[PDB]
Design an enzyme around this catalytic site. Structure first.
Site, PDB file in Angstrom:
ATOM      1  N   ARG A  44       0.750  -1.249   0.000  1.00 37.03           N
ATOM      2  CA  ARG A  44       0.000   0.000   0.000  1.00 37.03           C
ATOM      3  C   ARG A  44       0.773   1.288   0.000  1.00 37.03           C
ATOM      4  NH1 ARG A  44      -3.200  -3.608   1.833  1.00 37.03           N
ATOM      5  NH2 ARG A  44      -1.381  -4.128   3.103  1.00 37.03           N
ATOM      6  N   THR A  45       1.795   1.420   0.885  1.00 40.65           N
ATOM      7  CA  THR A  45       2.451   2.722   0.971  1.00 40.65           C
ATOM      8  C   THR A  45       3.188   3.019  -0.334  1.00 40.65           C
ATOM      9  OG1 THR A  45       2.871   2.618   3.411  1.00 40.65           O
ATOM     10  CG2 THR A  45       3.977   4.244   2.090  1.00 40.65           C
ATOM     11  N   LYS A  90      27.475  -3.732  -2.448  1.00 42.64           N
ATOM     12  CA  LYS A  90      28.860  -3.269  -2.373  1.00 42.64           C
ATOM     13  C   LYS A  90      29.195  -2.722  -0.986  1.00 42.64           C
ATOM     14  CE  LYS A  90      28.360  -2.072  -7.208  1.00 42.64           C
ATOM     15  NZ  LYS A  90      28.352  -3.416  -7.722  1.00 42.64           N
ATOM     16  N   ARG A 120      11.051   3.999   2.875  1.00 52.51           N
ATOM     17  CA  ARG A 120      10.656   3.115   3.939  1.00 52.51           C
ATOM     18  C   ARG A 120      11.956   2.558   4.512  1.00 52.51           C
ATOM     19  NH1 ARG A 120       5.302   1.664   5.216  1.00 52.51           N
ATOM     20  NH2 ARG A 120       5.233  -0.485   4.325  1.00 52.51           N
ATOM     21  N   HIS A 139       4.876   6.916  11.176  1.00 52.42           N
ATOM     22  CA  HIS A 139       4.289   6.620   9.898  1.00 52.42           C
ATOM     23  C   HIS A 139       3.416   7.818   9.541  1.00 52.42           C
ATOM     24  CE1 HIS A 139       2.955   4.188   6.437  1.00 52.42           C
ATOM     25  NE2 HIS A 139       2.297   3.231   7.058  1.00 52.42           N
TER      26      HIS A 139
END
Ligand SMILES: [Zn+2]
Ligand SMILES: [Zn+2]
Lengths: 310, 146, 146, 310, 310
Positions: free
Chosen positions: A54-55, A84, A105, A134
């Site tokens: 969703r986000t 790396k 996120r 959030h």
């Protein structure tokens, strides 16, 4: 010039009652009348170092509905931070030399404030950082409450679930404590209880809150029932006694519900909302998810346009 | 005098078994100048105190702010040409940077090149320290845990 | 100018820079006695020294010898009621136990509940320590870590 | 009682030319005149926390060929140290209350000395503690060197291979620096060269040692070419540049060699001793392995019988 | 029609001094004046069979800033070459029936020339192929040198790091050997030294180069210090002695630096540039990374537009 133009959206604590209200007024507006080239020619990064349906997909679709371009990654596994070995500080330093806003996120708490310190002048909008904040969730929760209740003052709001690790309930109690007369009811297993730091704040502001062993004991008094998920991926070993949900909303329980009452849930949901609740006029979690499109379009509009007239 | 310096600092009313941590923390051995340390001397009210005497040296901001968070009893005396030109006790600050380590295992501050920073709400109980990064607040005892 | 002492031990003539390294290494501060330490003192004999006076405390034969490892030119002054009753001095000890950690990562002494021990050895420039257990000899400087 | 009765055997550095000489003399006796019942009623623990073919099996065959009973393990996986979490010290402490002598192999240098502190009165014979010492290896080498070269004094000995980690060459260089006028040639890579501490010990007794980059350079001069396997398992990842035997020895090379010379090897051999050496007069390694029985059973006898065998 | 229109960009060897200079003139120009629909209606593939943050995200953002559409994958794990087992030859054959230019990263050396042989008429631009070539890096390095030094002739350039596996230094020495009077200084661990094939070329052209054990020994004489990363993922077992960097630039070392000197690094960087160098007026690696946008926009402009007038 508008107050959230160029701002970083990291935590609800730095957002005021008026910043929130400017988002919802904006939201409602683009929802009445869509702006397809409002961000025509901006490129936006979408950096997801942790899982999302969703986000990220709502964010990315809001960016497209406004005319922007998206570049990014759905897992660090392929970035050079994942293979790396570079720091997150270098990641954000080069990505801010390429794009116009970073959406990210991230599993450790605090990574969004980390990014801002290296992003130069690019705004960093926090899609979620571990169990901390959030903000953009909270903006679509407030848009959905206003839409069903016509008020964000004097509600009876019950928060059911994993409140310790719930980044969503941590942001939502901080935004609703900025409106008048909201009563709070916390129903969580106690080892996954609400952090005392939000509680002290609820106390310093003289807001009324309370604990309840049950959902039947508050069903009759609530305007919103905000259900949450047991954050398995965040639980410590000690808490394994807590992976299966304690309080499970079933359609029968809604029997003595206020007619106006809405069942909200950030989603994904596991066993805690029985699918029989989905067919009642109280379940409203999918409408809440749709409302992610107008709130995150309003957030991008305001941070990247000095003045909107709409 | 109970010892003597022309210019410099004398810190006093250090709790026992804090003077030596303080020598450690502010690196006060990286110094070619005289130092007197009074380990576990008296202090009538609170029996034994430690006392540190850094000759012809004075403390910078940060150290005294730490001193506020490690020894709220202590009092620091600016001595110039033997005259105690100023004796000032510490008051806590708003924020402590680069020495406390945040208690949250999952705080980004650990894995990444950033100096730590803590906000300081003096609670009626104790000192609440809030991380800059994860936004968690802890008991100063959780944090100062050596 | 430091302090008058009733009875005990005053390790005098510790090279300036090692006085603190010793109060840490052998648990001297971990007492309830009055300790007075003078870091950086004019000696003439040496430019600068260091000096620790531990009141109501004596050292042992091996204790003092442990000091040879960091402070051969120290002098342990045994004092009984203001008389310098003893003028003790460090030879190399044959074994230091319990204070050092073997640089060999795969030595058993790390994983099991046993104290360390090293046979000391005057090699041909510095001093060499052979672990009891893995039997590897190491430079004494190495042992004193990084 | 004899010089090694109840005495622990942890390192060659604690034994004298006199004890070595007694152990080989006893080994020559027992090879000539077996004593089937010599340890009839003794039980010995055979504890291998590491891999073995040669040492664990010749030890348990020597114990058996003297009437002893063997209990123990060849793997720690299924001991409580292996799965329930106990210390070595508590393994050794409970196992000292059951058996008459402990033979033990461990991956950590210092494990047999650690086990004497808790074995009480029970002796601990070291079957190899990490890369430190392997004293019973050295006794079957010395028995084999004197068996072939007639003597253990004034020998030219070239030790080729991994000397850093060779618990075998560490004990054997210490065993041979106790007789007179033995000459060393050490042929290793730099990274796996002989331990400094060993050479110091050589310098003090003024033993002549000399490095050499080729078998061919020492071939004609030597009497015992003692070859070693690269301790693959102990190498640091930095050391993985030399996992393959730098010096490998084929039969061609024995062209210019002393007709008394013997090629010795602790074994396992991997690539360093080519299978054609196996047919030469010079190869003596399968012969050296079998001398493991007599050296190993002469040791057991002396540590558990006061009465010297004849 | 322009000379790089429809060309494949695989190796710096096939690019001339004038092709390079046409890219930088183009770069500087789009950097002065941005062309947002220059590639309006082209779709470009972005095929990354190996990790990236900068090359892919810069490429993709340049494509968007010019009006193009991007399709692709960040890992072969999901392609049918990674799960159903198809050849890279078939992959590139169907992808060239869909798109207008292929950008690809790939772990085996040579995969970019492979693609061209199957791409039909679609241009293949090499984002990096194992340790071979990295052309588009070199174009943003040359743009950044010109920008800080006003010349690409007569520099003193020191290349510090993993020059054996460094695809970036392999491409940059080949492009700077096409300008006059550039002096080269190689500082690498010798088992990760510059390939003799570039060295022979440096010799056939009579360019001056040299080896130095240290960075302090050339700091005073250099215009650019090009730092690199130890390609762990490319090292062979033998080289594990070399994963931790040998030469680490710290801010103190810059003390005797020419004021004009710039520290370049392709990035990611690990331990070899201490973060204290980032705050000096010599560190310029993040500006170099920003310059990836104008050089890769110029490369796409020229390969896909027959004539540009700008
Ligand atoms: Zn934190
Ligand atoms: Zn050891």
């Amino acid at each position: 010039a508008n107050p959230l133009y160029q701002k970083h959206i990291i935590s609800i604590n730095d957002l005021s009652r008026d910043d929130l209200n400017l988002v919802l007024a904006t939201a409602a507006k683009l929802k009445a009348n869509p702006q397809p080239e409002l961000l025509k020619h901006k490129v936006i990064a979408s950096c997801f170092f942790e899982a999302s349906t969703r986000t990220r997909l709502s964010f990315q679709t809001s960016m497209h509905r406004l005319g922007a371009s998206v570049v990014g990654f759905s897992d660090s596994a392929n970035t050079s931070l994942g293979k790396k070995g570079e720091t997150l500080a270098d990641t954000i330093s080069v990505i801010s030399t390429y794009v116009d806003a970073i959406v990210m996120r991230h599993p450790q708490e605090g990574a969004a404030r980390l990014a801002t310190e290296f992003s130069g002048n690019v705004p960093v909008l926090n899609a979620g950082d571990g169990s901390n904040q959030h903000p953009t969730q909270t903006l679509l929760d407030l848009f959905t409450i206003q839409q069903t209740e016509g008020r964000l003052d004097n509600l009876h709001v019950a928060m059911v679930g994993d409140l310790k690790y719930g980044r969503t309930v941590h942001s939502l109690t901080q935004a609703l404590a900025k409106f008048d007369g909201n009563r709070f009811y916390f129903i969580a297993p106690d080892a996954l209880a609400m952090p005392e730091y939000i509680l002290d704040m609820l106390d310093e502001k003289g807001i009324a809150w309370s604990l309840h062993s049950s959902i039947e004991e508050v069903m009759a008094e609530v305007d919103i029932l905000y259900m949450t998920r047991v954050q398995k991926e965040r639980l410590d070993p000690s808490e394994y006694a807590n992976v299966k949900a304690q309080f499970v909303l079933r359609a029968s329980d809604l029997h003595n519900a206020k007619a106006n009452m809405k069942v909200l849930h950030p989603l994904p949901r596991v066993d805690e909302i029985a699918t029989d609740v989905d067919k009642t006029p109280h379940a409203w979690y999918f409408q809440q998810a749709g409302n992610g499109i107008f709130a995150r379009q309003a957030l991008l509009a305001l941070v990247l346009n000095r003045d909107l007239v709409l | 005098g109970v010892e003597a310096i022309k210019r410099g600092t004398v810190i006093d009313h250090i709790p026992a078994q804090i003077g030596f941590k303080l020598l450690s923390l502010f690196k006060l051995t990286e110094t070619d100048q005289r130092i007197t340390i009074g380990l576990n001397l008296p202090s009538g009210e609170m029996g034994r105190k430690d006392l540190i005497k850094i000759e012809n040296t004075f403390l910078s901001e940060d150290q005294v702010d730490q001193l506020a968070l490690y020894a709220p009893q202590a009092t620091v005396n600016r001595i110039d040409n033997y005259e105690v030109v100023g004796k000032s006790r510490p008051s806590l600050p708003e924020r402590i940077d680069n020495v406390l380590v945040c208690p949250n295992s999952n705080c980004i501050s650990h894995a990444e090149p950033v100096s730590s920073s803590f906000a300081v709400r003096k609670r009626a109980n104790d000192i609440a320290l809030k991380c800059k990064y994860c936004e968690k607040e802890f008991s100063h005892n959780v944090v100062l845990a050596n």
